[PDB]
Amino acid sequence: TGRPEWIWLALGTALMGLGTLYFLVKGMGVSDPDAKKFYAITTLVPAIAFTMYLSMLLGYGLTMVPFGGEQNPIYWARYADWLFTTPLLLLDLALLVDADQGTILALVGADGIMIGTGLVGALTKVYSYRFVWWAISTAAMLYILYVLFFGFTSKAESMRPEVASTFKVLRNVTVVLWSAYPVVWLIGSEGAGIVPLNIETLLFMVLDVSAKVGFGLILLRSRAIFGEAE
């Protein structure tokens, strides 16, 4: 409670934990193999985020990085979370549209580059270089978003209508919420430092719960996760 952002870390921990438990109960009894994949991916996402939020709340997922002549508090646990949860979210989208394996690997690999370069930027001690890493990570994000809007055209013709509808909604949610991340980083403690760490933590908490629990609620309530069966 010594850090003003503790309240948002505590709320994030609670919301990710509750979301995990809800998805775990909801997926109980699901037998359809396709739906099992979506429940597994979508329950793992907030479960991982729960552990990383808790690690930030308890102080383990925080480190001090010297730059700008200050000791800057950097929550590195965010990147350990996003390293696993962001490819999993992309996998949900890719499995919805029956994406080719080449496209899945492109997405997951670009996503690993996005998170890894974000982590390097977050830990870099030369201030100006932090924004070089931010730019590379943003380029990887833009590549991901490009693939989500222009890499699935060969699947549109054979796509079930409920699949197309649910995918279109999730793609819109993804573009809006994922785009906000580089902006928060750029203006917050890890970039220019014009927004204080407590407001940055609040912003990432709203984004993360929306991108994980909100996204999951939309996906797991849709008919698109079940194979077409009589």
Ligand X SMILES: CCCCCCCC/C=C\CCCCCCCC(=O)OC[C@H](O)CO
Ligand Y SMILES: CCCCCCCC/C=C\CCCCCCCC(=O)O
Nearer to ligand Y, 131 or 226 (CB): 131
Looking up tokens 């060969």 gives: 154
**Residues from 112 through 171 that contact ligand LFA (CB under 6 A):** 112, 123, 128, 131-132, 135, 168-169
Nearer to ligand X, 194 or 218 (CB): 218
From the list ligand X, ligand LFA, ligand Y, none, partner contacted by residue 192 (C-beta under 5 to 8 A by kind): ligand Y
For ligand LFA, which residue of 25, 149, 156, 172 counts as binding (CB under 6 A)? Answer: 172
Nearer to ligand X, 103 or 165 (CB): 103
CA distances in angstroms from 61 to 71, 146, 195, 215, listed in the order given:
16, 32, 20, 25
Between CA 227 and CA 54 the distance in angstroms is 36
Looking up tokens 């940055």 gives: 200
Helix (H, G, I), strand (E, B) or coil at 31: coil
Looking up tokens 């492109």 gives: 106
Least distance to ligand Y, CB of residue 69, Å: 11
**What tokens does 89 get?**
């979210």
183 touches ligand Y (CB under 6 A)? no
Contact 113, 169 (CB under 8 A): no
**What tokens does 169 get?**
């909604």
198 touches ligand X (CB under 6 A)? no
From the list ligand LFA, ligand Y, ligand X, none, partner contacted by residue 46 (C-beta under 5 to 8 A by kind): none
Alpha helices in 97-160 (DSSP H): 101-123, 127-150
Between CA 187 and CA 184 the distance in angstroms is 5
Least distance to ligand X, CB of residue 228, Å: 23
15 touches ligand X (CB under 6 A)? yes
**What tokens does 46 get?**
């907030």
**What tokens does 183 get?**
């902006």
Non-local (6+) Cβ contacts of 127 within 8 A are 67, 68
Question: What is the contact surface with ligand X in residues (CB under 6 A)?
Answer: 15, 18-19, 22, 26, 63, 80, 102-103, 106, 109-110, 113, 136, 139-140, 143, 151, 209-210, 213-214, 217
Question: What is the contact surface with ligand LFA in residues (CB under 6 A)?
Answer: 7, 10-11, 13-14, 17-18, 48, 51, 63, 76, 79-80, 83-84, 87-88, 91, 108, 112, 123, 128, 131-132, 135, 168-169, 172-173, 176, 187, 194-195
